[PDB]
Nucleic acid binder design. Structure first.
Ligand SMILES: O=C(O)CNC(=O)C(=O)O
Ligand SMILES: [Cl-]
Ligand SMILES: [Fe+3]
Ligand SMILES: [Zn+2]
Ligand SMILES: [Zn+2]
Ligand SMILES: [Zn+2]
Length: 413
DNA sequence: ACCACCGGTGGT
DNA sequence: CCACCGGTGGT
């Protein structure tokens, strides 16, 4: 690993990593995933996706899907997207780039988190501004224009800071990982309890399904316990962000730790909680640099055509829709109605845009640090009653010092 | 190079 | 409100 080519050119074959899983061929991946998940056959679904490196986006630079991978039946339990690396014959020729557990957390818990997080964050949440909230031009209105109701991200836990080259709480006597508006310890305590319990629950699923990435993220658990979430032995997570009707424009999460992954737990509005329902709107998670294969897991063309006809792979067509654009770009540190369309993305077969439609209670695992990814904008974003909430669990780089890096920073001053 | 980032504290 | 801390991938 590796002599297939003299140079691994990642802009040609895609980013190379094996910590979600890797093998000589697709069959080897099924064996790995069958072993990990504890079931065989129909319970596991593998889709081959192809890295094209050409980004699907609207004429305004905002996220679009060209294909949607949807849960095929209630019998399908685990979805894995795999990349067969262009021109490789070695033991890591095929790598796993996304794992989706459809039935991730109990539905009663997912129902409750959706209510409680919506209510808490609408009343007390302080929003976190991120780069990926806007397009390149900084002029789109994908989140909505009503500041009371627009899509938003709320970040909790620990985060890396360039100022300390370590945890942002380096100088905080009593850090509040779950800081809400004002100073209401009781509401923060409730929110902490929800997210800590969820961290605790998701850790063993992470270990089960992506053991190498998991084991990477727990290597320094005992050195930096204050920079970890979770209430039981085994604490891979450090930060968590709640995204409510939030359109994440194409991005990578660049200060996530090397060789780790992100877990996304999805909660949906009450009209999208039944298999085979037709919700009024939905949000998709998109890999803009990939296209779907002409062939299914096992190499059949016909089987892939079956899936396209059944809607297990939804082939989308281009749109031409009215959208808002701000008169001034949003800064660092009025609006007009414009035409937005996706026609150019659909004319080129090699422009990417593979989406998955995560369901209520599902858990998605991907290397967000390395893979370009995005979420689609809602028709009418409303964080007071969101179409989708994502809870995104991660660990940043350089979060391996005790007490949020207090001692190390003191040594510096 | 060079932009822009899932920021918090202490003192006016 | 303000000054104070300044690491890097993508391009
Ligand atoms: O919500 C999702 O599915 C994707 N979220 C992100 O990529 C993010 O918050 O960085
Ligand atoms: Cl990641
Ligand atoms: Fe992301
Ligand atoms: Zn946009
Ligand atoms: Zn090779
Ligand atoms: Zn910390």
């Amino acid at each position: 690993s590796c002599r297939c080519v003299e140079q691994i050119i990642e802009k040609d074959e895609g980013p190379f990593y094996t910590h979600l899983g890797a093998g000589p061929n697709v069959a080897a991946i099924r064996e790995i995933m069958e072993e990990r998940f504890g079931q065989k056959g129909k319970a596991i679904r593998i889709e081959r996706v192809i890295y094209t490196g050409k980004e699907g986006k609207s004429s305004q630079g905002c996220p679009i899907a060209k294909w949607v991978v949807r849960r095929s039946s209630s019998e399908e339990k685990l979805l894995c997207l795999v990349r067969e690396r262009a021109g490789h014959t070695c033991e890591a020729a095929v790598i796993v780039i996304l794992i989706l557990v459809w039935e991730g957390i109990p539905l009663s818990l997912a129902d409750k988190l959706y209510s409680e997080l919506t209510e808490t964050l609408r009343k007390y949440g302080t929003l976190t501004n991120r780069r990926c909230a806007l397009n390149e031009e900084r002029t789109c209105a994908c989140q909505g224009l009503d500041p009371e109701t627009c899509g938003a991200s709320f970040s909790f836990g620990c985060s890396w800071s360039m100022y300390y080259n370590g945890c942002k709480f380096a100088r905080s006597k009593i850090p509040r990982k779950f800081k809400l508006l004002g100073d209401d310890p009781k509401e923060e305590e409730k929110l902490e309890s929800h997210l800590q319990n969820l961290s605790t629950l998701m850790a063993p699923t992470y270990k089960k399904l992506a053991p190498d990435a998991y084991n990477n993220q727990i290597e320094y658990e005992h050195r930096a316990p204050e920079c970890r979430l979770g209430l039981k032995e085994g604490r891979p997570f450090s930060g968590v962000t709640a995204c409510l009707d939030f359109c994440a424009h194409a991005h990578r999460d660049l200060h996530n730790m090397q060789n780790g992954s992100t877990l996304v737990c999805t909660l949906t509005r009450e009209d999208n909680r039944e298999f085979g329902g037709k919700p009024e709107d939905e949000q998709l998670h998109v890999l803009p640099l990939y296209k779907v294969s002409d062939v299914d897991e096992f190499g059949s063309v016909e089987a892939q055509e079956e899936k396209k006809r059944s809607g297990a792979i939804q082939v989308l067509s281009s749109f031409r829709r009215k959208v808002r654009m701000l008169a001034e770009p949003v800064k660092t540190c009025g609006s007009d109605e414009v035409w937005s369309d996706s026609e150019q993305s659909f004319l080129d077969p090699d422009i990417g845009g593979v989406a998955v439609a995560p369901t209520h209670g599902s858990i998605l695992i991907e290397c967000a640090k390395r893979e370009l990814h995005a979420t689609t904008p809602l028709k009418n974003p409303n964080r007071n009653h969101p179409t989708r909430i994502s809870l995104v669990f991660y660990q940043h780089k350089s979060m391996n010092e005790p007490k949020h890096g207090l001692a190390l920073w003191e040594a510096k001053m």
